[PDB]
Amino acid sequence: ASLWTAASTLVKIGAGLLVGKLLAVSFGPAGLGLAANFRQLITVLGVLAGAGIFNGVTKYVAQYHDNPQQLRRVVGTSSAMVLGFSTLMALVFVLAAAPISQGLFGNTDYQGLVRLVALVQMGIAWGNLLLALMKGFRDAAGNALSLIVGSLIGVLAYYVSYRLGGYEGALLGLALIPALVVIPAAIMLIKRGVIPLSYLKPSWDNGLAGQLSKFTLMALITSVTLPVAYIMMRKLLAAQYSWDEVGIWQGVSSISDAYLQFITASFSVYLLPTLSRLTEKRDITREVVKSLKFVLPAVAAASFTVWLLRDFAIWLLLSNKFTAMRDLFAWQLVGDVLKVGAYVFGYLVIAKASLRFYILAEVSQFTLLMVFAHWLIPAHGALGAAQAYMATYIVYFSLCCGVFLLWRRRA
Amino acid sequence: VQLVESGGGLVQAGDSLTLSCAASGRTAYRYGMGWFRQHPGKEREFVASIWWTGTTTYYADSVKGRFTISRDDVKNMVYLQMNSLKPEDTAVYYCAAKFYGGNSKRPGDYAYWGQGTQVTVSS
Amino acid sequence: AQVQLVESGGGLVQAGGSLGLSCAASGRTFSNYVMAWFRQAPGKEREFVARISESRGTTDYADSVKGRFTISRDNAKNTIYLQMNSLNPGDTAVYSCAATLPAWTGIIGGRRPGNYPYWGQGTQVTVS
C-alpha cells in the first residue's frame, strides 16, 4: 500500500490544476499558448538537468544500500555527474539565451528569462538527485512529504512571481515550482538522518558512471525528440495562426494531463518492476495484455467523462475565453487512449533497456507528428494539431502491436 | 446559415462607420467569416476575415490599422468597424461564411454569401 | 493575430531635430490594452521607450528618453503616438509599438518586452 506516493501525486496534480487555471485566467489563450514552449523546456530539465541519472540512482542505491563502500561510490559518482552537467547547463543557458528564446518564443525578448533558468535548473538537478536518493532508501514518506511542501511553496512562489513580474513572472514562477523542491528535500534528507552528508562528496567511479551514462543517453534521446517536436508544431501553428490559437490546443492537452498522471501512477510503481524480473516470452505477453485490459478502459472512461463535461471542464480548470476547445476534445482524447496504450509497449522497452528500440519508438512518434502536422496544421490550425496528435498514435499503436507480434515470433 | 448586411451608407472622408452582418441561428459559432468588397464591374477583393475559433484575424495591407473585424456569438452577428474611410474604400461590402474556415483570401473558399451593403465615401 | 499593429513614420533626421511616430491597431476593445513603444539597434535587445496605461492615461518613460519623448493614445482611432523631440544619434533604432493586457504587466514588469504578446513590424528611425 503505497499511500505516500498517491498522496504526493494528488497534491502535485491539484497544484498543477491551480497554477494552470491562474495562468489561463490571467493571461488567456495567448499566455497559455506562449508559455507552452517554456513549460516544455522545464519538463526536459527535470528529465535531464542532473544528467538524467536519477532512475539509475534509485536503482543502484537499492542494490548497494547494504554495502557502505559501494553505497558511497554510487552517490559520490551521481553527485559528480549532477554537478558537472548543472555547471555545463548554466554555461549554455547564459551563453545562448537569445537563440533559445528564438526557438521557444520566436523573439529574443526572453533572454533574461533563459539566463535566470541557468540558476533555476541547478535546483532542478540537485532537488531531483535528493529525491532519487530518498527513493532508493525506500523512504516514501520523506519523498512524498518533500514533494508536498515543495508543491505548496511553489504555488506560493508562483503567485508572488506573477503578481510582481507579470507574464514573465508567471513563467519564472513555473520554473520555481520544481526548483524550490531542494529546500524541503535537503531538510528531509539531513534532519531525518537517512544518510550522512559525507556520502555526497563528488567522487568518480569509472564503472558506475558508464551505467548511469546509459541513463543519460536515454534521457537525451527523450529530450531531443518529442519535446522539440511539440515546439516546432506550436511554432508553425503560431506562425500561420495566432498565439491565441496555440492556447486553444494547449488547453485541451492541459486538461487531459490531469487524469493521465494518476493513471500512469499504476505504471512505474507496479508495471516496470514486474517486466524487468520475468524473462520468458509467454510470461511477458501475459503481463502486457493484462495491463492493456486495465489502462485502456481506464483512460477511455476518464476521457469520455471529460468529453461529457467539456463545457464544464473548460469553465472549471481554465477560463470561458477558452470556449473554442470544445470541438478539439474528441480528437485529442482518442490519441490519449492510444498513447497510454502504447505506454505499456514503451515500458517494456525501458525494462529491456534496448536503446535501439527506445530510439526507434521516439523517432517514430516524432516523424509521425511532423508529417501529420505539416499536412494538417496549415489547413485546420489548432484542430489540425489535435487531428495530427490522434493520427500519429493511431499509426503508432497499430505499428507497436505489429512489431510486438513480429518480435513475439522472433522477427 | 443565412447572411444579411446592414450599416452602410454615404460618409465623408476620415469618419467612422460600422458594418453589421446578421447570421442565422444554427451552429453559426463553428463558421468562419470574412469581408469582401467589389468595385463596379471589378472582382471581389479581400478586406478582413476572422478564424472560426475567434482567435486569429486576417487583414489586407490596404486594410490593417483602420478596420476591425469581430464577432458577437450571443447575437449571431459579425461586425466590421471602419475608422478612417478613404475614397478607395468605396465599393460594395459582402460578408461570407465558411464552416471550419475563415483563413483564406480567395472568395471561392467561402460557400455562403450575403446580399451586400454599399458604402460611398466622398471628398 | 487578435490585435495586429501597424507602425508609420520615422526615417532620417538630424541631431537635435524632431520626429513623430504613430501606431494603428486593428482589434476589438483597444481601450483595454497597455500600449508601449520599444526600440532596437542591430545586434542589441529590444529596449523600453515609453508606455501608456489603459485607465487614466498614465505614462512611463525610460531614463534615456524622459523629457524628449512623449507618448499619447487616442482610443477613438485605435492609434497611439510617440512625439520624439530632442534626438541624439544614439536614438537610431527600429521602433516598435506593442500591446498587452494589464495582467501581463504585473507590478514591476511594465518595461519588459516579453510581457507584450502583440507587436508591430517596426519602423526605422535614423538620427544623423
XYZ file of C-alpha atoms in Angstrom:
662
model
C 0.000 0.000 0.000
C 1.943 3.000 -1.337
C -0.349 5.686 0.034
C 2.516 8.192 0.285
C 3.058 8.019 -3.482
C -0.629 8.532 -4.283
C -0.915 11.416 -1.805
C 2.037 13.321 -3.275
C 0.693 12.613 -6.766
C -2.666 14.086 -5.740
C -1.119 17.215 -4.211
C 1.070 17.695 -7.289
C -1.940 17.411 -9.609
C -4.041 19.827 -7.555
C -1.287 22.439 -7.704
C -0.887 21.973 -11.455
C -4.618 22.483 -11.934
C -4.356 25.597 -9.751
C -1.413 27.361 -11.408
C -2.726 26.259 -14.800
C -6.054 27.922 -14.029
C -4.354 31.106 -12.815
C -2.162 31.188 -15.932
C -5.252 30.775 -18.126
C -7.417 33.333 -16.311
C -4.692 35.975 -16.013
C -3.126 35.670 -19.481
C -5.790 33.927 -21.578
C -5.157 31.771 -24.646
C -2.219 33.962 -25.680
C -0.479 33.226 -22.385
C -1.236 29.503 -22.324
C -0.005 29.199 -25.909
C 3.175 31.209 -25.423
C 4.108 29.547 -22.117
C 3.632 26.089 -23.656
C 7.101 26.025 -25.218
C 8.659 27.272 -21.974
C 6.828 24.650 -19.908
C 8.312 22.089 -22.304
C 11.899 23.128 -21.544
C 11.149 22.759 -17.827
C 9.980 19.151 -18.095
C 13.063 18.344 -20.178
C 15.255 19.856 -17.454
C 13.505 17.695 -14.866
C 14.391 14.814 -17.190
C 17.978 15.864 -17.985
C 19.315 18.772 -15.872
C 21.043 16.373 -13.485
C 22.242 14.273 -16.437
C 19.021 12.258 -16.078
C 20.638 9.567 -13.919
C 18.082 9.701 -11.095
C 16.314 6.472 -12.046
C 19.735 4.862 -12.322
C 20.491 6.436 -8.943
C 17.496 4.920 -7.138
C 18.196 1.532 -8.758
C 21.883 1.143 -7.868
C 21.264 2.730 -4.461
C 18.854 -0.067 -3.536
C 21.353 -2.597 -4.906
C 24.133 -1.333 -2.612
C 22.191 0.225 0.283
C 23.686 -2.556 2.448
C 27.340 -2.126 1.354
C 28.603 1.160 2.883
C 31.557 1.160 0.469
C 29.568 0.709 -2.747
C 26.794 2.956 -1.402
C 29.259 5.842 -1.095
C 30.666 5.227 -4.578
C 27.263 5.330 -6.291
C 26.135 8.541 -4.567
C 29.508 10.253 -4.955
C 29.572 9.458 -8.674
C 25.944 10.544 -9.076
C 26.677 13.835 -7.313
C 29.656 14.307 -9.643
C 27.509 13.871 -12.756
C 24.807 16.217 -11.439
C 27.333 18.930 -10.571
C 29.211 18.813 -13.873
C 26.090 18.710 -16.037
C 24.483 21.500 -13.991
C 27.522 23.734 -14.457
C 27.595 22.942 -18.177
C 23.856 23.619 -18.268
C 24.402 27.013 -16.642
C 27.035 27.901 -19.246
C 24.966 27.048 -22.322
C 21.988 28.907 -20.843
C 23.907 32.116 -20.138
C 25.748 31.915 -23.477
C 22.753 31.067 -25.697
C 19.871 32.888 -24.012
C 18.777 34.643 -27.221
C 18.899 31.575 -29.543
C 16.867 29.577 -27.015
C 14.275 32.356 -26.747
C 14.148 32.364 -30.559
C 13.479 28.636 -30.887
C 10.989 28.736 -27.999
C 9.184 32.082 -28.356
C 10.098 33.415 -31.811
C 11.602 36.595 -30.327
C 14.730 37.261 -28.269
C 12.672 39.261 -25.744
C 13.035 36.465 -23.150
C 16.851 36.477 -22.906
C 16.758 37.323 -19.208
C 14.280 34.524 -18.540
C 16.503 31.850 -20.104
C 19.608 33.156 -18.324
C 17.910 33.077 -14.917
C 16.863 29.475 -15.635
C 20.571 28.562 -15.534
C 20.375 29.132 -11.783
C 16.909 27.573 -11.557
C 17.945 24.383 -13.367
C 20.553 23.759 -10.663
C 17.674 23.468 -8.204
C 16.113 21.027 -10.660
C 19.154 18.749 -10.762
C 20.004 18.775 -7.056
C 16.378 18.529 -5.936
C 15.824 15.540 -8.212
C 19.042 13.870 -7.035
C 17.975 14.314 -3.404
C 14.559 12.818 -4.165
C 16.038 9.883 -6.090
C 18.236 9.296 -3.035
C 15.218 9.067 -0.722
C 13.546 6.705 -3.203
C 16.449 4.250 -3.221
C 16.311 4.095 0.579
C 12.601 3.123 0.414
C 11.769 6.422 2.146
C 8.374 7.008 0.567
C 7.354 9.239 3.485
C 10.263 11.669 3.194
C 9.875 11.720 -0.586
C 6.126 12.380 -0.585
C 6.443 14.978 2.177
C 9.243 16.832 0.372
C 7.062 16.764 -2.753
C 4.056 18.121 -0.843
C 5.911 21.033 0.778
C 7.729 21.752 -2.482
C 4.491 21.978 -4.450
C 2.955 24.196 -1.755
C 5.871 26.640 -1.626
C 5.794 26.530 -5.420
C 2.228 27.847 -5.558
C 3.365 30.495 -3.078
C 6.331 31.279 -5.333
C 4.193 31.387 -8.486
C 1.703 33.864 -7.008
C 4.258 36.457 -5.891
C 6.233 35.889 -9.099
C 3.352 36.600 -11.484
C 1.990 39.396 -9.282
C 5.340 41.210 -9.312
C 6.687 40.220 -12.725
C 3.525 39.817 -14.777
C 3.678 37.234 -17.547
C 7.438 36.670 -17.387
C 6.975 36.442 -13.627
C 4.441 33.674 -14.195
C 7.000 31.992 -16.461
C 9.698 32.287 -13.794
C 7.196 31.010 -11.237
C 6.597 27.872 -13.299
C 10.361 27.343 -13.122
C 10.375 27.794 -9.343
C 7.757 25.079 -8.708
C 10.112 22.097 -9.357
C 13.280 24.001 -8.481
C 12.340 25.065 -4.937
C 11.986 21.369 -4.024
C 15.661 21.482 -2.987
C 14.758 23.138 0.318
C 12.234 20.546 1.605
C 14.235 17.640 0.165
C 17.515 18.749 1.747
C 15.808 19.346 5.092
C 14.190 15.908 4.987
C 17.335 14.085 3.836
C 19.526 15.659 6.531
C 17.220 16.041 9.538
C 15.791 12.528 9.149
C 19.285 11.021 9.141
C 18.585 8.664 6.243
C 22.180 9.199 5.034
C 25.154 11.268 6.266
C 26.252 14.205 4.140
C 29.767 12.755 3.747
C 28.353 10.416 1.084
C 27.553 13.363 -1.221
C 31.177 14.439 -1.723
C 31.795 14.175 -5.500
C 33.944 11.193 -6.464
C 34.341 9.350 -9.765
C 33.852 5.624 -10.341
C 34.514 4.741 -13.989
C 32.187 1.739 -13.891
C 29.157 3.295 -12.208
C 29.469 6.382 -14.416
C 29.097 4.292 -17.571
C 25.933 2.608 -16.303
C 24.413 5.947 -15.308
C 25.662 7.271 -18.661
C 23.260 4.898 -20.412
C 20.504 6.509 -18.344
C 21.796 9.889 -19.533
C 21.787 8.750 -23.171
C 18.184 7.599 -22.755
C 17.061 10.958 -21.350
C 18.990 12.682 -24.149
C 17.045 10.694 -26.747
C 13.873 11.573 -24.841
C 14.748 15.282 -24.801
C 15.646 15.917 -28.453
C 12.673 14.006 -29.900
C 9.100 14.557 -28.732
C 9.864 17.849 -26.891
C 11.439 19.507 -29.934
C 8.569 18.038 -31.966
C 5.883 19.832 -29.958
C 7.900 23.065 -30.082
C 8.095 23.111 -33.884
C 4.381 22.331 -34.149
C 3.406 25.168 -31.806
C 5.772 27.493 -33.679
C 4.330 26.534 -37.068
C 0.840 26.845 -35.579
C 1.561 30.286 -34.108
C 3.075 31.406 -37.433
C 0.054 30.633 -39.623
C -2.487 31.495 -36.908
C -2.152 33.343 -33.587
C -0.556 32.501 -30.262
C -4.152 32.548 -29.002
C -4.779 29.570 -31.290
C -1.852 27.794 -29.618
C -3.543 28.345 -26.260
C -6.709 26.708 -27.584
C -4.938 23.458 -28.457
C -2.597 23.585 -25.460
C -5.631 23.897 -23.195
C -7.031 20.515 -24.203
C -3.624 18.976 -23.514
C -3.531 20.660 -20.099
C -6.914 19.170 -19.168
C -6.036 15.654 -20.324
C -2.774 15.811 -18.358
C -4.843 15.948 -15.151
C -6.117 12.358 -15.077
C -3.338 10.832 -17.188
C -0.671 11.056 -14.477
C -2.831 9.420 -11.809
C -3.311 6.697 -14.426
C 0.447 6.454 -15.065
C 0.943 6.019 -11.313
C -0.352 2.488 -11.988
C 2.657 2.025 -14.311
C 6.086 2.883 -12.878
C 5.344 1.548 -9.393
C 3.653 -1.741 -10.392
C 4.396 -2.462 -14.062
C 8.084 -1.542 -14.557
C 9.474 -3.713 -11.698
C 7.436 -6.670 -12.984
C 8.541 -6.769 -16.638
C 12.185 -6.485 -15.571
C 12.039 -9.600 -13.377
C 10.214 -12.010 -15.699
C 12.029 -13.315 -18.776
C 10.017 -15.980 -20.631
C 8.058 -14.837 -23.685
C 4.721 -16.315 -22.586
C 5.180 -14.599 -19.215
C 5.945 -11.243 -20.857
C 2.954 -11.317 -23.221
C 0.612 -12.130 -20.326
C 1.739 -9.035 -18.406
C 1.395 -6.725 -21.414
C -2.111 -7.975 -22.159
C -3.333 -7.646 -18.568
C -2.091 -4.052 -18.276
C -3.867 -3.164 -21.527
C -7.068 -4.747 -20.188
C -6.783 -2.249 -17.297
C -5.360 1.012 -18.631
C -7.212 1.104 -21.972
C -10.716 1.034 -20.387
C -9.459 3.276 -17.569
C -8.260 6.076 -19.856
C -11.312 5.624 -22.101
C -13.736 6.098 -19.202
C -11.892 9.191 -17.959
C -11.620 10.636 -21.476
C -15.291 10.058 -22.297
C -16.226 11.690 -18.983
C -14.265 14.887 -19.619
C -15.789 14.925 -23.107
C -19.225 14.670 -21.493
C -18.453 17.764 -19.377
C -16.192 19.574 -21.848
C -18.213 22.750 -21.308
C -17.787 22.346 -17.552
C -14.128 21.332 -17.908
C -13.177 24.495 -19.802
C -15.165 26.658 -17.386
C -13.657 24.897 -14.352
C -9.958 24.262 -14.998
C -9.481 27.120 -17.480
C -11.493 30.216 -18.456
C -14.571 30.851 -20.567
C -12.273 32.657 -23.024
C -11.165 29.096 -23.892
C -14.621 28.091 -25.134
C -13.259 27.233 -28.607
C -11.616 23.967 -27.386
C -14.920 22.063 -27.231
C -14.506 20.545 -30.705
C -10.832 19.637 -30.231
C -11.751 17.467 -27.226
C -12.851 14.398 -29.197
C -9.785 14.250 -31.444
C -7.269 14.660 -28.609
C -8.824 12.120 -26.239
C -8.652 9.346 -28.837
C -4.926 9.990 -29.187
C -4.613 9.919 -25.398
C -6.121 6.429 -25.223
C -3.702 5.222 -27.898
C -0.708 6.958 -26.306
C -1.421 5.339 -22.928
C -1.961 2.039 -24.728
C 1.426 2.378 -26.413
C 2.810 3.289 -22.974
C 2.840 -0.388 -21.974
C 4.936 -1.224 -25.035
C 7.371 1.559 -24.164
C 7.666 0.457 -20.537
C 8.624 -2.979 -21.880
C 11.444 -1.426 -23.916
C 12.534 0.598 -20.874
C 12.767 -2.624 -18.858
C 14.815 -4.183 -21.672
C 16.986 -1.011 -21.767
C 17.230 -1.505 -25.542
C 18.474 1.900 -26.675
C 17.807 0.677 -30.221
C 14.098 0.160 -29.534
C 13.789 3.363 -27.491
C 15.394 5.364 -30.311
C 13.009 3.745 -32.795
C 9.998 4.461 -30.573
C 10.772 8.157 -30.086
C 11.863 8.707 -33.694
C 8.675 7.049 -34.961
C 6.477 9.327 -32.844
C 8.444 12.443 -33.816
C 8.273 11.587 -37.523
C 4.554 10.770 -37.462
C 3.893 14.012 -35.573
C 5.882 16.125 -38.043
C 4.340 14.804 -41.264
C 0.777 14.899 -39.919
C 1.176 18.460 -38.643
C 2.660 19.665 -41.941
C -0.429 18.270 -43.692
C -2.998 19.424 -41.110
C -1.562 22.463 -39.281
C -1.667 24.964 -42.208
C -5.174 23.769 -43.134
C -7.147 23.227 -39.915
C -4.967 25.109 -37.420
C -5.333 24.104 -33.778
C -7.892 21.443 -34.673
C -5.450 20.150 -37.281
C -2.920 19.757 -34.477
C -5.361 17.640 -32.470
C -6.115 15.707 -35.663
C -2.367 15.171 -36.029
C -1.949 14.039 -32.407
C -4.619 11.366 -32.912
C -3.443 10.150 -36.313
C 0.167 9.558 -35.239
C -0.873 7.465 -32.239
C -3.376 5.641 -34.440
C -0.458 4.547 -36.617
C 1.852 4.305 -33.596
C -0.419 1.984 -31.603
C -1.027 -0.141 -34.702
C 2.683 -0.245 -35.538
C 3.628 -1.009 -31.927
C 1.314 -4.027 -31.853
C 2.655 -5.209 -35.206
C 6.304 -5.116 -34.169
C 5.240 -6.809 -30.923
C 3.738 -9.831 -32.687
C 6.749 -9.799 -35.018
C 9.156 -9.668 -32.069
C 6.957 -12.236 -30.304
C 7.556 -14.623 -33.230
C 11.307 -13.788 -33.339
C 11.449 -11.351 -36.245
C -26.791 29.855 -42.163
C -28.161 32.995 -43.848
C -26.246 36.283 -44.003
C -27.773 39.760 -44.287
C -25.963 43.101 -44.319
C -26.551 46.448 -42.613
C -24.828 49.641 -41.511
C -23.646 51.074 -44.830
C -24.420 54.422 -46.437
C -22.740 57.600 -47.606
C -19.988 59.009 -45.375
C -17.317 61.668 -45.667
C -13.576 61.041 -45.796
C -11.962 60.328 -42.432
C -15.117 59.452 -40.489
C -16.022 56.101 -38.947
C -18.627 53.523 -39.938
C -19.773 50.165 -38.575
C -20.870 47.296 -40.819
C -23.108 44.532 -39.467
C -23.755 41.046 -40.860
C -26.511 39.014 -39.191
C -26.335 35.220 -39.317
C -28.981 32.531 -38.947
C -29.086 30.719 -35.623
C -27.767 27.220 -36.321
C -24.197 26.178 -35.379
C -23.060 29.641 -36.503
C -20.276 29.612 -33.891
C -18.432 26.927 -35.901
C -18.485 29.092 -39.061
C -15.591 31.282 -40.180
C -16.399 34.708 -41.579
C -14.839 37.250 -43.908
C -15.491 40.588 -45.574
C -15.078 41.353 -49.279
C -15.561 44.490 -51.360
C -16.116 44.995 -55.070
C -15.675 47.906 -57.460
C -18.279 48.468 -60.212
C -17.500 45.705 -62.696
C -14.340 44.597 -60.871
C -13.603 41.498 -58.811
C -14.394 40.842 -55.146
C -11.167 41.536 -53.257
C -10.377 40.636 -49.663
C -10.877 43.007 -46.738
C -10.762 41.069 -43.464
C -11.588 37.621 -42.093
C -11.880 36.031 -38.660
C -10.869 32.463 -37.869
C -13.783 30.252 -36.868
C -12.454 29.998 -33.296
C -12.243 33.784 -32.899
C -8.537 33.850 -32.008
C -6.966 34.714 -35.382
C -7.955 37.618 -37.633
C -6.615 38.374 -41.109
C -6.480 41.783 -42.803
C -5.331 43.099 -46.163
C -2.464 45.567 -46.429
C -4.844 48.322 -47.574
C -6.958 47.472 -44.525
C -4.741 46.804 -41.498
C -4.708 49.505 -38.830
C -8.046 51.103 -39.752
C -10.663 48.339 -39.916
C -11.549 45.872 -37.156
C -13.453 42.618 -37.687
C -15.033 40.948 -34.659
C -17.877 38.583 -33.818
C -20.714 38.539 -31.278
C -21.859 34.964 -30.680
C -24.865 35.715 -28.458
C -26.313 37.954 -31.202
C -25.116 35.824 -34.164
C -23.624 38.892 -35.851
C -20.270 39.778 -37.417
C -19.006 43.364 -37.367
C -16.607 45.445 -39.457
C -15.767 48.656 -37.596
C -14.381 51.217 -40.053
C -12.370 54.155 -38.706
C -10.617 56.250 -41.408
C -12.545 55.752 -44.636
C -10.893 56.891 -47.873
C -12.368 57.190 -51.411
C -10.577 53.969 -52.369
C -12.742 52.115 -49.831
C -15.831 52.977 -51.910
C -17.205 49.595 -53.006
C -19.930 47.067 -52.168
C -19.167 45.190 -48.947
C -20.061 41.490 -48.698
C -19.842 39.164 -45.701
C -19.099 35.491 -46.355
C -19.288 32.326 -44.251
C -17.344 29.062 -44.198
C -17.698 26.083 -41.873
C -14.423 25.426 -40.016
C -12.870 28.098 -42.246
C -12.136 31.796 -42.352
C -8.404 31.851 -43.181
C -8.475 32.141 -46.986
C -8.117 35.228 -49.172
C -9.956 33.757 -52.164
C -13.746 34.214 -52.341
C -14.146 30.690 -53.733
C -13.132 29.314 -50.326
C -16.299 30.865 -48.831
C -19.524 28.982 -49.515
C -22.234 31.268 -48.093
C -22.624 34.937 -49.034
C -24.684 37.973 -48.104
C -26.553 40.472 -50.247
C -24.039 43.275 -49.659
C -24.229 46.854 -48.396
C -22.888 49.756 -50.462
C -20.651 52.343 -48.781
C -19.670 55.506 -50.653
C -17.122 57.924 -49.177
C -16.695 61.398 -50.672
C -14.232 64.308 -50.693
C -3.207 37.804 -34.553
C -6.017 39.066 -32.342
C -4.705 42.652 -32.160
C -2.459 43.493 -35.116
C -0.373 46.675 -35.058
C 0.951 48.810 -37.924
C 3.692 51.408 -37.475
C 4.086 54.559 -39.558
C 6.583 57.386 -39.846
C 10.220 57.676 -38.914
C 13.289 57.705 -41.106
C 16.115 60.214 -41.417
C 16.526 63.120 -39.004
C 19.346 65.445 -37.997
C 20.684 65.562 -34.449
C 18.527 67.781 -32.252
C 15.582 67.624 -34.655
C 12.151 66.121 -34.078
C 10.201 63.163 -35.441
C 6.721 61.763 -34.825
C 5.690 58.107 -34.722
C 2.229 56.541 -34.931
C 0.893 53.012 -34.406
C -2.570 51.865 -35.523
C -4.412 48.895 -34.021
C -6.931 46.633 -35.779
C -8.517 44.811 -32.859
C -11.554 44.782 -30.618
C -11.575 46.816 -27.382
C -8.446 48.881 -27.935
C -9.082 50.972 -24.799
C -8.375 47.952 -22.558
C -4.778 47.335 -23.688
C -1.457 48.595 -22.347
C 0.298 50.305 -25.259
C 4.059 50.797 -25.316
C 6.919 51.762 -27.627
C 10.087 49.677 -27.961
C 13.223 50.360 -29.993
C 16.011 48.020 -31.052
C 19.511 48.533 -32.529
C 21.239 45.945 -34.763
C 22.607 43.212 -32.522
C 21.025 44.559 -29.322
C 17.985 43.518 -27.322
C 14.613 45.243 -27.511
C 14.580 48.153 -25.062
C 11.719 50.067 -23.470
C 10.936 53.614 -24.631
C 7.509 54.617 -23.317
C 4.174 53.148 -22.288
C 0.674 54.464 -21.620
C -1.815 52.987 -19.176
C -5.233 51.646 -20.137
C -7.024 53.568 -17.378
C -6.381 57.305 -16.801
C -3.671 57.685 -19.445
C -0.742 57.282 -17.057
C 2.592 57.400 -18.865
C 6.048 55.990 -18.171
C 9.315 56.711 -19.978
C 12.839 55.348 -19.968
C 15.745 57.055 -18.250
C 17.105 57.566 -21.780
C 14.188 59.434 -23.373
C 12.384 61.095 -20.442
C 11.786 64.738 -21.306
C 12.490 64.355 -25.020
C 9.928 61.649 -25.859
C 6.177 61.891 -25.262
C 3.675 59.064 -25.753
C -0.066 59.534 -26.199
C -3.116 57.478 -27.124
C -6.410 58.013 -28.945
C -8.914 55.228 -28.280
C -11.346 56.698 -30.825
C -8.969 55.967 -33.720
C -7.282 52.905 -32.138
C -3.926 54.669 -32.522
C -1.037 55.663 -30.268
C 1.535 58.383 -30.899
C 5.149 58.961 -29.869
C 6.496 62.500 -30.261
C 10.309 62.453 -30.207
C 11.694 65.945 -29.642
C 15.419 66.243 -28.902
C 17.177 63.478 -30.837
C 20.736 62.337 -30.196
C 22.389 59.907 -32.645
C 22.120 57.151 -30.023
C 18.363 57.038 -30.658
C 18.894 55.339 -34.043
C 16.881 52.111 -33.795
C 13.867 50.251 -35.154
C 10.912 51.447 -33.079
C 8.012 49.057 -32.492
C 4.696 49.579 -30.723
C 3.286 46.713 -28.662
C 0.006 45.846 -26.963
C -0.735 43.850 -23.827
C -3.378 43.456 -21.152
C -2.751 44.932 -17.678
C -2.428 41.460 -16.137
C 0.656 40.831 -18.289
C 2.426 43.895 -16.863
C 2.113 42.896 -13.211
C 3.655 45.470 -10.873
C 7.309 45.843 -11.926
C 7.155 44.227 -15.369
C 5.760 47.171 -17.310
C 9.029 47.789 -19.184
C 9.761 44.183 -20.229
C 9.189 43.389 -23.928
C 8.344 39.742 -23.223
C 5.241 40.982 -21.388
C 3.759 42.220 -24.699
C 2.468 39.424 -26.966
C 1.153 41.542 -29.858
C 3.708 43.546 -31.841
C 4.108 45.645 -34.961
C 6.522 45.388 -37.869
C 8.535 48.322 -36.515
C 9.777 51.424 -38.297
C 13.307 52.646 -38.942
C 14.456 55.876 -37.270
C 17.951 57.126 -38.141
C 19.452 60.193 -36.446
C 22.354 61.784 -38.320
